[PDB]
A paper describes a structure:
TRPV6 and its close relative TRPV5 are TRP channels that are distinctly Ca2+-selective and play an important role in calcium homeostasis. Structurally, TRP channels are assemblies of four identical subunits arranged symmetrically around the pore axis. The transmembrane domain of TRP channels includes six transmembrane helices (S1–S6) and a pore loop (P-loop) between S5 and S6. S5, P-loop and S6 form the KcsA channel-like pore domain, with the ion conduction pathway lined by the S6 helices and extracellular loops connecting the P-loop helix to S5 and S6.
Compared to wild type, TRPV6cryst has a 59-residue C-terminal truncation and four point mutations, including L495Q, which resides in the S5 transmembrane helix. This L495Q substitution, which was a spontaneous mutation that occurred during gene synthesis, was originally included in TRPV6cryst because it expressed at 3-fold higher levels than the same construct with the substitution reverted to the native leucine (TRPV6*). We reproduced crystals of TRPV6cryst and confirmed its non-swapped conformation. Disruption of these hydrophobic interactions leads to the non-swapped fold. Apart from the distinct connectivity between S4 and S5 as well as S6 and TRP helix, the domain-swapped TRPV6* and non-swapped TRPV6cryst structures were almost identical.
Author numbering: 28 to 408, 417 to 637
Write the structure that this text describes.
């Protein structure tokens, strides 16, 4: 493995230090022994250790300034020498002195003129999980991360370019946000901005990542609240202060739209980082997504919801009435348990009532491709948060097409693909349960919250039985209802599935008869979903009062509503859903869009 190798190497290095008396005296800070080695013997002062390190690199590790100065006085060319090893390719004796915050050694190394642009591309320095710290590749970046402002100043005085990026395209400002001590990195963040070019052109806070992220945008994705709040200070202007009230104005530039992915909100909803979800609760953002949902967001979800309900309830209205004929085959006693009256008329134009189902069948097709026309071109440019609605809706429209392909071929098994589209269409409309109110001046958790989680179940339950009672009816609409007639007509198919949803009915079972291939599959999935919804509901009934974890269930649901709010903003045209905030083009303050927020203090 790779972990053992460096563990072998770190142990291998200490051996060469123990062997090489120069490296040993450099580690032990033996000034008397060093003068014996370099002056009375002429030992290899260019002695490369096991990590390709010089005696000065060792003296820089263990803060031995006396021994380190002996190596520099007797050999001043060791300063420029970097370590040649693969794990440490690039690190010089300056990076070590900056890491250990040895101000006098750094002052002495800059005195002899050490390169402040020495990039350290060693394998141990890469931004990888096995590496504990990630400080970058330049000695200035090492100084900012250790919090030594005195070293930072000394490096800038020697021309340390603050605009320098590492291999991952991160400037020194990006690296500070990734450090744990965000409380202390805020102070170090301002110190580097003071050395900026002072021009509107080429601002260091505007320099993007290799993945196209500025220090602002990265702080939101990384979930660094203190850096995000700090960065917000220079992104807002206070209009006025009227007693307690303070009407501030937020820039709202790198936090909205006008980009394929140039948008912080799209990054928060798609990240695998759980910490980043706390960003959209901040005081320039929690007002934004709330206004996007309160108007234009909440109504269009119900409009598209009612359309999708009428779409699915029509597809079922055409599924309940399908071609019916007796089995017209003497094969009713061969396999006597057989009891099918299979029916595929496959060409009937009997149109007193079939023209009504003919136009309905075309609605089921033109919408399924429309579902594909709004989902298939979206997969090319996938995270559920967010709901698996998108995954379930595309397979539904895939099933309607298969049922269409199962038609025009008269395949005996057109019940199998038509059944999967029934539950996939309905179970997708329980995804429409999220809505109503997400406002929260007071994040309210009481009896209202238990009642809130119970009504989603009633919505989830009523939807599930509609998708499965219609399914169970189709399966047994063909068979003979004299034996196992739990679903002989639609009102009894619902009442049976309703009863079976609560496990009161024994469940349709008959063993002297052979039942269709679909009943065992559908009822097995029915028992799992029906118990999970009852099991999931039992947690919400208790997970609301035992602790403030109701706020944890609440805040994740808001992120689901916010993730849906960003979903309704991509495919919808521009004539609807106007842009958030107010533009800055006459009145003159643009060319950005600003959000007006006023708060009160007590
Ligand atoms: C101690 C080792 N000896 C040495 O001369 N350089 C190494 C420094 C170790 C730093 C490893 C930083 C990391 O985990 O990436
Ligand atoms: Ca029973």
């Amino acid at each position: 493995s790779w972990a053992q190798s460096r563990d072998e190497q770190n142990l291998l290095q200490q051996k060469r230090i123990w062997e090489s008396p120069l490296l040993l005296a450099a580690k032990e800070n033996n000034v008397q022994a060093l003068y014996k080695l370099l002056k009375f013997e002429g030992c290899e002062v260019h002695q490369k250790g096991a990590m390709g390190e010089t005696a000065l690199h060792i003296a820089a590790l263990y803060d031995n300034n006396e021994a380190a100065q002996v190596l520099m006085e007797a050999a001043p060319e060791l300063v420029f020498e970097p370590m040649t090893s693969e794990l440490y390719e690039g690190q010089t004796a300056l990076h070590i002195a900056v890491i250990n915050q040895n101000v006098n050694l750094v002052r002495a190394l800059l005195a002899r003129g050490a390169s402040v642009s020495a990039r350290a591309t060693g394998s141990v320095f890469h931004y990888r999980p096995h590496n504990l710290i990630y400080y970058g590749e330049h000695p200035l970046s090492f100084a900012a991360c250790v919090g030594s402002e005195e070293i930072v100043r000394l490096l800038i005085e020697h021309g340390a370019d603050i605009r320098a990026q590492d291999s991952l395209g991160n400037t020194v400002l990006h690296i500070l946000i990734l450090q744990p001590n965000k409380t202390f990195a805020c102070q170090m963040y301002n110190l580097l901005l003071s050395y900026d070019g002072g021009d509107h052109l080429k601002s260091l806070e505007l320099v993007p990542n290799n993945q196209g992220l500025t220090p602002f945008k990265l702080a939101g994705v990384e979930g660094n609240i203190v850096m995000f709040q700090h960065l917000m200070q220079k992104r807002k202007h206070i209009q006025w202060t009227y007693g307690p009230l303070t009407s501030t104005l937020y820039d709202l530039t790198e936090i909205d739209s006008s980009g394929d992915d140039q948008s912080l909100l799209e990054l928060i909803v798609t990240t695998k980082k759980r910490e980043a979800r706390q960003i959209l609760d901040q005081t320039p953002v929690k007002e934004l997504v709330s206004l996007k949902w309160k108007r234009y967001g909440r109504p269009y979800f119900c409009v598209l919801g009612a359309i999708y309900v009428l779409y699915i309830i029509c597809f079922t209205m055409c599924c309940v009435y399908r071609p019916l004929k007796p089995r017209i085959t003497n094969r009713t006693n061969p396999r006597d348990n057989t009891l099918l009256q299979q029916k595929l008329l496959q060409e009937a134009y009997v149109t007193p009532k079939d023209d009504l189902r003919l136009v309905g069948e075309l609605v089921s097709i033109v919408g399924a491709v429309i579902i594909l026309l709004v989902e298939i071109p979206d997969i090319f440019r996938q995270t559920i948060l967010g709901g698996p609605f998108h995954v379930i809706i595309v397979t539904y429209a895939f099933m309607v097409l298969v049922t269409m392909v199962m038609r025009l071929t008269n395949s005996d098994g057109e019940v199998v693909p038509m059944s999967f589209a029934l539950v996939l269409g309905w179970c997708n409309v329980m995804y429409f349960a999220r809505g109503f109110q997400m406002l929260g001046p007071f994040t309210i958790m009481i009896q209202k919250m238990i009642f809130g989680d119970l009504m989603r179940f009633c919505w989830q339950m009523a939807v599930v039985i509609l998708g499965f009672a219609s399914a169970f009816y189709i399966i047994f609409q063909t068979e003979d209802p004299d034996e196992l007639g739990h679903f002989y007509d639609y009102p009894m198919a619902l009442f049976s599935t309703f009863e079976l949803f609560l496990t009161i009915i024994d469940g349709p079972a008959n063993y002297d008869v052979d039942l269709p291939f679909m009943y065992s599959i559908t009822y097995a999935a029915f028992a799992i979903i029906a118990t999970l919804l009852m099991l999931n509901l039992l947690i919400a009934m208790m997970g609301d009062t035992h602790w403030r974890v109701a706020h944890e269930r609440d805040e994740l649901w808001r992120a689901q509503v916010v993730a849906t709010t960003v979903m309704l903003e991509r495919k919808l045209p521009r004539c609807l859903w106007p842009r958030s905030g107010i533009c800055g083009r006459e009145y003159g303050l643009g060319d950005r869009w600003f959000l007006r927020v006023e708060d009160r203090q007590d």
